[PDB]
């Protein structure tokens, strides 16, 4: 049995969404207290009047705000028996590869979020290899929705591809018949480009989520629902407690075949141009995120309709969708077949928060709990060693404390091709 | 090309690179300075003996005792064909700000820790003094870094001792809470967000984990041509000033003074930048700090690259398995000697059935008395009292304990002496000489000497505040190793009586001890006698 | 209640001082003999027995 | 029961030689004038 130090190396990733995801961290000792939630406020929008003589139409102020919060720890807890050699020989091979798969595990967190709480849907009805140009298609389809939503980009924008879809466009580039920069670079090498229609950011991505087709069929809306955006709310004891700007919850016919992620739209309602509140030309779209009854949803862009008449004007100064819900509007659905997505977003609208594990205290004796940073993504979670001998043996964890938030689901999108059928 | 993401690979290549050395490098720490019984599972077990008959500290105390009689500092000494006193302003300054407590301190840290685990390190830094500034309201001062092994991680792809063509370094900043709220005052940070960093996971001895704050420093160094003016001096001359140092505050305060540009021209130059760094997010950015060299300097022992691997060692990561083995073996004898039934009589209970008094050690009675007859067998069987064998050590366990202890005896010889670590101390010492001189130049207040006096050339702004302006004549003076002087005057009365033990007994032994006599300190008789030796020179002219 | 002088008006001195790991261990002389002087008193209170 | 426990020195003589060594060697502090101050700006302070 002759064995050798020399590693064959098999497996290598990359994760690109969680370097650019911002990465926020707040003050701990608050943060136990809060119960692990922050909040945040939204932009002001204003309401408008016009006339000379307005009496008793002042309006009031109204400020909205999300919250952002953590989930659970994400370990590799594992035990080291203290006399075998195939244990003593792969024990520091197992914290790098620890370290890789934390990193992956965050980067795919991501990745679910982004594209399971996308409220933009950019939905093709044939592939991208189909047409000549269809990949630009995309991505300028992408870059139009965000434009005409008036939606804020300044700290920029981006868009993955899954490799499927990326070797589309290379091919499409390929296929001109012609080689000047764009086809040359795209033949020698598989990129497209670095910035594509607009985008500022575009790569492959290799573990972007494919997105299951809904079993959804005629589906209604019960009632006419009106939602009203609100800062806080009563409770029960008179307590005044906040509310989520990012979510709504619906009454439907039936929920059933619905998910977490699904794309639905109401028929009749539109968009909107959110500052100038203009309608345009394209349905608005939602994302399912929680589907809570038998007969509830909950989707992540609320439907303020701006022709409301029980809206307050600043309430109204939120409005988003032309119209209302009429209590028999067709919920059609928008993802009617498998199909892996490509996503797009802007860079602010998702965060990572992340929290310490002060394990190092003098409460754990017998414990050396040491920091222990990520590679890849920027993040710091703990590595803690305690012996034992009831088994005779050693237990080493390494724990991370972070989570996920899309702070702005109206500014994340999905890109879904090929949805004939 | 996100700068968190770019530091902290740079950061993460490093610190996998100096896996190995760091480990071997905290094992040799650990094994001399806290317990030679590196075990962590042995204290959940059941208790044996394990003692510590320690044979190589009393080397490593030696060694330290040795390489702390011999002090050694900077020497500036000037260049060829330099004017002959162009060290004279840079030496003093040394000597100023080197003398206090703090740098001997560091070198000393760092002297102790090159000889236990191999590796030892120190800093320069800058700071603000408004009461006994050395030049220009700024002193620079000396710092040690703990731990120089785990706390400095050099750039990978250095093939130097000293660390000069390092492009990079992190420093690990380790403090309390407090500290960490005096370092967030200071430096301009969030008190509330809660800093973090990488630091070594190990197993031994979880006693030792302080409840504390954790930062880095990454310093990099990057080599450019920028521009600098050459202006006419109204004085004299035409001095050369960098752009970059007067591009606002002065640019034209140097007009209005009187300084006609002549000529601009593109030099190259080193520039430093510090960033202050947690591992989620950069706090400080790339504050430009002086001197063309990383503030950093460590300190080697046995030092090279086995194949593209760095490799260092003091002088204990080598007796570590004999005085591993030795406790061992000590502590296998001890348990003989406790744990072992002694030397008594074997008995049948009917051989002294009735006489049991005679035989528990009281001294009441003249003999002992046995049993003789038995009721059913006749009489006893004959056969002699047999004893508990006496414990005794094995041959195997006084073998090896005589063979490790002189196989550590033979191992724990550093040289034949200390010099190559004296080498290696001095290699560390020139290479702070040019970093203080970089920063010097940078920051300090240098006066040019002229055959015509000390023309000190600077000029405020509109802020009230004075920018240095030192011509780019300014490396005059190289780097040397000496003996340690605490001031410029003990250094001319060390050369005095140097001079003095060779010169015969001529004229020249009256002239220099009447100089010696001259450079003497103050009180009244030493007064007397410099008052006098002032008159004999003055006269004799 | 401000009291004279810039440092604090203590003056520590060591033997053997310095750092493990952010830990200050300072040593004297007697810390490593102990294990021998007590191998030595137990094994001469043996023998007197 | 009450054993015997005796105490048999060897580390005290030590201690005693060292302390003894340390004793025969005394050290004060020493203010010396700094470079170009008047050659006795340290004997009041030294004398105080």
Redesign the interface.
């Known amino acids: 049995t002759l064995a050798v130090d020399e590693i064959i190396e098999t497996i290598s990733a990359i994760t690109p969404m969680a370097?650019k995801a911002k990465?926020y961290?707040?003050?701990?000792?608050?943060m136990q207290r809060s119960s692990n939630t922050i909040w945040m406020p939204v932009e002001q929008e204003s309401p408008t009047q016009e006339g000379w003589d307005l009496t008793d139409k002042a309006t009031g102020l109204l400020e909205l705000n999300v919250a952002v919060n953590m989930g659970e720890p994400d370990n590799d807890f594992f035990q080291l028996r203290?006399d075998d050699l195939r244990d003593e020989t792969a024990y520091?091979r197992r914290?790098q590869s620890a370290a890789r798969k934390l990193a992956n595990n965050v980067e795919l967190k991501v990745a679910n979020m982004a594209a399971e709480m996308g409220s933009l849907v950019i939905t093709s009805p044939d592939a991208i290899g189909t047409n000549t140009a269809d990949a630009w298609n995309f991505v300028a389809d992408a870059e139009e929705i965000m434009f005409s939503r008036e939606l804020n980009r300044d700290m920029g924008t981006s868009y993955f591809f899954n490799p499927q879809d990326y070797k589309k466009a290379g091919y499409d580039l390929t296929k001109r018949d012609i080689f000047g920069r764009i086809p040359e670079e795209a033949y020698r090498d598989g990129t497209i480009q670095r910035q594509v229609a607009g985008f500022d950011d575009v790569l492959r991505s290799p573990k972007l989520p494919v997105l299951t087709k809904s079993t959804a069929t005629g589906i209604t809306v019960s009632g006419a629902q009106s939602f009203k955006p609100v800062a806080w709310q009563l409770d029960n004891d008179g307590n005044k407690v906040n509310v989520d700007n990012r979510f709504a919850t619906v009454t439907l016919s039936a929920t059933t075949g619905m998910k977490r992620g699904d794309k639905i739209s109401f028929a009749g309602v539109k968009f909107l141009g959110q500052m100038a509140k203009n309608v345009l030309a394209q349905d608005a779209t939602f994302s399912v995120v929680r589907v809570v009854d038998g007969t509830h949803v909950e989707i992540t862009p609320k439907p303020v309709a701006l022709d409301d008449v029980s809206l307050s004007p600043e309430q109204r100064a939120y409005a988003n969708v032309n119209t209302s819900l009429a209590d028999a509007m067709a919920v059609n659905i928008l993802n009617v077949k498998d199909a892996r997505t490509n996503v797009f977003w802007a860079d602010d609208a998702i965060r990572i928060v992340?929290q310490?594990i002060?394990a190092?205290?003098?409460l754990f004796?017998?414990?050396?709990?040491?920091?222990?940073?990520?590679?890849?993504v920027?993040?710091?979670g703990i590595?803690a060693?305690?012996?034992?001998?009831s088994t005779?043996s050693?237990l080493c964890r390494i724990a991370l404390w972070y989570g996920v938030n899309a702070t702005r689901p109206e500014a994340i999108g999905v890109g879904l091709p090929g949805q004939t059928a | 090309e996100?700068r968190?993401?770019s530091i902290?690979?740079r950061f993460?290549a490093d610190w996998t690179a100096s896996?190995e050395a760091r480990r071997e490098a905290?094992n040799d720490?650990?094994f001399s300075?806290?317990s030679q019984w590196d075990d962590?599972?042995s204290?959940?077990?059941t208790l044996q003996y394990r003692?510590?008959?320690?044979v190589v500290?009393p080397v490593v105390?030696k060694l330290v005792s040795e390489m702390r009689q011999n002090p050694i500092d900077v020497l500036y000494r000037p260049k060829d064909g330099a004017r002959p006193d162009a060290a004279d302003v840079l030496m003093?300054m040394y000597?100023?700000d080197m003398r206090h407590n703090t740098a001997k301190i560091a070198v000393n840290?760092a002297v102790?820790?090159q000889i236990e685990a191999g590796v030892g390190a120190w800093r320069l830094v800058t700071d603000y003094e408004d009461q006994s500034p050395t030049s220009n309201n700024q002193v620079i001062r000396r710092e040690p870094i703990?731990?120089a092994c785990?706390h400095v991680i050099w750039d990978s792809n250095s093939k130097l001792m000293d660390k000069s063509d390092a492009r990079h370094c992190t420093v690990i900043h380790?403090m309390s809470q407090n500290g960490w709220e005096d370092f967030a005052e200071k430096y301009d940070l969030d008190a509330?967000?809660?800093p973090?960093?990488?630091?070594?996971?190990?197993?031994?001895?979880?006693?030792?984990?302080?409840?504390?704050i954790?930062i880095a420093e990454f310093y990099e160094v990057v080599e450019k041509k920028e521009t600098a003016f050459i202006y006419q001096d109204p004085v004299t001359g035409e001095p050369v000033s960098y752009f970059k140092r007067d591009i606002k505050d002065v640019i034209d305060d140097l007009a209005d003074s009187g300084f006609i540009k002549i000529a601009e021209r593109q030099i190259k130059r080193r520039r430093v930048y510090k960033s202050i760094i947690?591992?989620?997010?950069v706090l400080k950015d790339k504050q430009l700090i002086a001197g063309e060299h990383i503030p950093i300097v460590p300190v080697f022992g046995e030092w090279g690259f086995v194949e593209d691997k760095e490799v260092y060692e003091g002088v204990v990561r080598l007796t570590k398995d004999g005085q591993r083995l030795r406790n061992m073996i000590m502590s296998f004898n001890?348990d003989i000697?406790?744990r072992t039934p002694k030397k008594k009589p074997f008995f049948w209970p009917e051989q002294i059935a009735g006489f049991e008094h005679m035989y528990d050690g009281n001294d009441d009675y003249p003999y002992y008395l046995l049993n003789r007859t038995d009721e059913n067998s006749g009489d006893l069987p004959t056969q002699p009292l047999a004893y508990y064998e006496n414990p005794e050590v094995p041959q195997a366990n006084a073998y090896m304990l005589e063979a490790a202890t002189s196989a550590v005896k033979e191992v724990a010889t550093l040289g034949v002496e200390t010099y190559v670590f004296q080498d290696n101390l001095a290699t560390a010492m020139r290479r702070d000489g040019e970093i203080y001189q970089s920063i010097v130049n940078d920051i300090y207040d240098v006066p040019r000497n002229v055959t015509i006096l000390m023309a000190e050339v600077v000029d405020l702004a509109t802020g009230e505040k004075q920018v240095l302006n030192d011509i780019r004549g300014r490396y005059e003076c190289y780097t040397d190793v000496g003996p340690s002087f605490?001031?410029?005057?003990?250094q001319n009365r060390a050369e005095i009586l140097e001079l003095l033990g060779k010169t015969p007994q001529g004229t020249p032994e009256y002239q220099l001890l009447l100089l010696q006599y001259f450079t003497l300190?103050?009180?009244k008789g030493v007064?007397m006698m410099?008052d006098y030796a002032n008159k004999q020179l003055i006269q004799m002219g």
């Not at chain 1, 004796?365 to 890849?376: E, H, L, R, V």
Request: net charge negative.
């Open positions: 370097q990465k961290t707040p003050p701990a000792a608050s203290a520091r914290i992340s310490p002060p190092n205290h003098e004796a017998g414990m050396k709990t040491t920091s222990f940073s990520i590679p890849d920027g993040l710091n590595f060693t305690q012996g034992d001998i005779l050693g | 996100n968190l993401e902290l690979s993460d896996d905290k720490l650990f300075r806290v962590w599972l204290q959940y077990t003692g510590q008959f320690d500290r105390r003093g000597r100023t840290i102790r820790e703990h731990s785990s380790s509330d967000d809660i973090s960093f990488q630091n070594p996971n190990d197993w031994v001895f979880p006693w030792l984990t302080q409840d504390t954790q947690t591992c989620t997010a001890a000697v406790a605490q001031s410029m005057k003990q300190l103050d009180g007064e410099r």
